[PDB]
Design a binder for this molecule. Structure first.
Ligand SMILES: O=N[O-]
Ligand SMILES: O=N[O-]
Ligand SMILES: O=N[O-]
Ligand SMILES: [Cu+2]
Ligand SMILES: [Cu+2]
Ligand SMILES: [Cu+2]
Ligand SMILES: [Cu+2]
Ligand SMILES: [Cu+2]
Ligand SMILES: [Cu+2]
Lengths: 333, 333, 333
């Protein structure tokens, strides 16, 4: 009787931050209550000022990271305000049945719905909007996030020993397909219906115009760089709802990686780069050993440095000259 | 002395169905005899009526799934009737030597050949035509299938316990490269030789025009949807002879997945999505827990919903409201 | 005190060959000294005579394979002669800190530098140039190689038993983006600065014009085919610094594969094809069982046979008719 279970309300935070949670479950199974409000909004996604009509969960690209434990129940109140124009829904890859919930959550502007599902499998998973007949358009407009279902006894390494992170970040990577004219300039549109065919044409090229973290070129840089201290253990959850990516921490590694995101599997050790398939969330655990600036990228380096799939860590602490040193600094022959 | 071994003749069936076999070998090693007849034929591959000159094994795209046990011998009689126009052959990724058999099986129209190889490694494997100098053209014309080499004691989970499927399906995923004119319309051709350069140009874009299951958009839908019952254990073998794919069961999971298809490895558990590299077969085992319609896709959702890489399951049985329920159906604020 | 450790100077060799080393470390930890000289040079990369301005480490595409043991120190003297025109550096994915060394190794023409780092993680790893603001341009001009960090007790299988190779080869796979005019012909350029915008435009298509092994179409064929004998154990290290690849030995397998290249993980067994993500090195171990010509490809077969990603083995020895035989050679119905 689910009515006999504790309810806990989560208050979500904007990526790349993650709402408060316990790695090791401090209670029995719970109904974990989430509310998200769909927001269609204009977003500037690059340095040139290219502006798209984004389709978001809770105002952000990606949508926020939801965190529960295995065999909790996720109960999501999904709100589509009458300020929006389109029908939306939600598919949880973590859930079982009804297209991940998409068949049960169709909300027109001015409607809401509440979905409950049992989180029976531990892992990080994509969630995304998926309205029948317009699925890739919603997804590639930004309407996707992730949910982490932690094992009730937290994470474990390949030998069954605990892995405990000190910090977690959620990197949502988004492929956009901004329609171009024959000369190669981006087109803009009066209404979503006038945009639709050109959106479909642009998607069918299979060539993103932009690939970004946290919704825009440079979003995880400067005053919004990710941070860590030397010696800190950091989990980076990374999702891509529509296209493969190959994350890499420039100057570091994935000490333990679940490339396809499912924690009943032993992690891959010592990864330089790992493949997260489109439609998947993955997670990488790293203990920082050196201070300084790191870049965290999709290691198709064109996708990283030309199309936007690059963020930064700023890491504080002492430099270890045993691990790396400039023996002879650049100088002239 | 191979002549002292039992011979068993297999009678193949059209994908996505799979010929009768035993998971656990009920005999010792056998010479397992297959016959396939090459058929060049016109195929309509989309809803618009786009018609290509397909190159098939046994009349289908994909070619049929062949099933043997580890250390059986596969003996294939490959027939190229004089109604065909081209030279063909066959490369088995399951086989060792002579380019997988391709160097020994070159048949002109009006010829046949018989190849035997020992299936020394368990797994699902691609087979495909591969004539020297025209390899991708044959493959991306549909001339590929798969062979499953089961361990003699059937499949096992990550702990060494048996996994037994109740039903198996074979999903062959095909990238086609239909040549386009400058305006973007598909071109058609009088002869394969007149088609060849434009086929090569279209392939060199690396952008498929179509990505389909079982040879056509919507082939595994409607009256040809895949079926299952709640509680049934289903293995879905999935091949892609030329390009990566990322299968996903919408509303389900891969409970146990061999993403790169080789059963001596422990399966990955609880996958949302998995990457099958181009040139590979993979296999996913799932026990259905909910009735209703599922979609089975390549989770590049553009590839799925715009280019064709989507099929359906229809699943019969009782709905489990513990696992998922609509708490409050969509309604107006 | 690193000054108390043995120093050993390595003399590199041109890919696909690999400098002399011991699988099992015959000494304690060492400072292993390497020198590489950057060479910008023209290279003809295809049969048509297409000539690019390559950016190399030590004159080759890929750069040479460097081999050390876990917890050795790599000390690289990197020389940028004043005959070059550009700034370069080096990022080792094997290293920890300072963007893999890239932040500490910026050398203008006429400068050199010496970097030392501790090789704390065993595996094969990419190294590549990565100058801030021009990273993909350098990488996709050929300026990448790999380093193998062997476990001090050599390689092990999935059960912890030794795997010892008799021969090793290094296959560097390079995606080039030669700018094209509207008609589709390659453009050429007076200076790297005049080339830059068109290089960036060509990269942003995400469609390589060429994908080659060892720097050119057909480089690992003919008198430069890879060789082996029946019964020989061969490790093929394969890198791709910028784009996914899916290696396949036509007629063989990867008996043991580290697809993402890190030897603390058990290898995947019996692979037909494996995915090496862009920004990764992987390694496949195979014992040849049949003589003859093999092709070793990226199993996107368009990428292999049309764009260049194909090499050959010539294997000497006896043919095993148990493993494969032509029962009835091609002949007429
Ligand atoms: O190591 N990242 O380019
Ligand atoms: O969950 N498939 O979109
Ligand atoms: O088996 N390679 O096409
Ligand atoms: Cu939506
Ligand atoms: Cu999905
Ligand atoms: Cu053929
Ligand atoms: Cu093949
Ligand atoms: Cu450089
Ligand atoms: Cu890198």
């Amino acid at each position: 009787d689910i009515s006999t279970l504790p309810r806990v309300k989560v208050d979500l935070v904007k990526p790349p931050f993650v709402h408060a949670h316990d790695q090791v479950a401090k209670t029995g199974p719970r109904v974990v209550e989430f509310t998200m409000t769909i927001e269609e909004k204009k977003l500037v996604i690059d340095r040139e000022g290219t502006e798209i009509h984004a389709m978001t969960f809770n105002g952000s690209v990606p949508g926020p990271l939801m965190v529960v434990h295995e065999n909790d129940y996720v109960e999501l109140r999904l709100i589509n305000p009458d300020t929006n124009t389109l029908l939306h829904n939600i598919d949880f890859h973590a859930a079982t049945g009804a297209l991940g919930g998409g068949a049960l959550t169709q909300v027109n502007p001015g409607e809401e719905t509440t979905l409950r599902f049992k989180a029976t499998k531990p892992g990080v998973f994509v969630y995304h909007c998926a309205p029948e007949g317009m699925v890739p358009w919603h997804v590639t407009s930004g309407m996707n996030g992730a949910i982490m279902v932690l094992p009730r006894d937290g994470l474990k390494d390949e030998k069954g020993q605990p892995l405990t992170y000190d910090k977690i970040y959620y990197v949502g990577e988004q492929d956009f397909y901004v329609p171009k004219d024959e000369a190669g300039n981006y087109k803009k549109y009066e209404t979503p219906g006038e945009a639709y065919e050109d959106a479909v044409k642009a998607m069918r090229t299979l060539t993103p115009t932009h690939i970004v973290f946290n919704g825009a070129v440079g979003a995880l840089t400067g005053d919004h760089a990710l941070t860590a201290a030397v010696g800190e253990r950091v989990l980076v959850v990374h999702s891509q709802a529509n296209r493969d990516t190959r994350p890499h921490l420039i100057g570091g590694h994935g000490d333990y990686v679940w490339a396809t995101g499912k924690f009943r599997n032993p992690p891959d050790l010592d990864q330089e780069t790992w493949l997260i398939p489109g439609g998947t969330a993955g997670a990488a655990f790293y203990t920082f050993r050196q201070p300084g600036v790191y870049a965290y990228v999709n290691h198709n380096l064109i996708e990283a440095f030309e199309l936007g799939a690059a963020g930064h860590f700023k890491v504080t602490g002492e430099w270890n000259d045993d691990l790396m040193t400039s023996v002879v600094k650049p100088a002239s022959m």
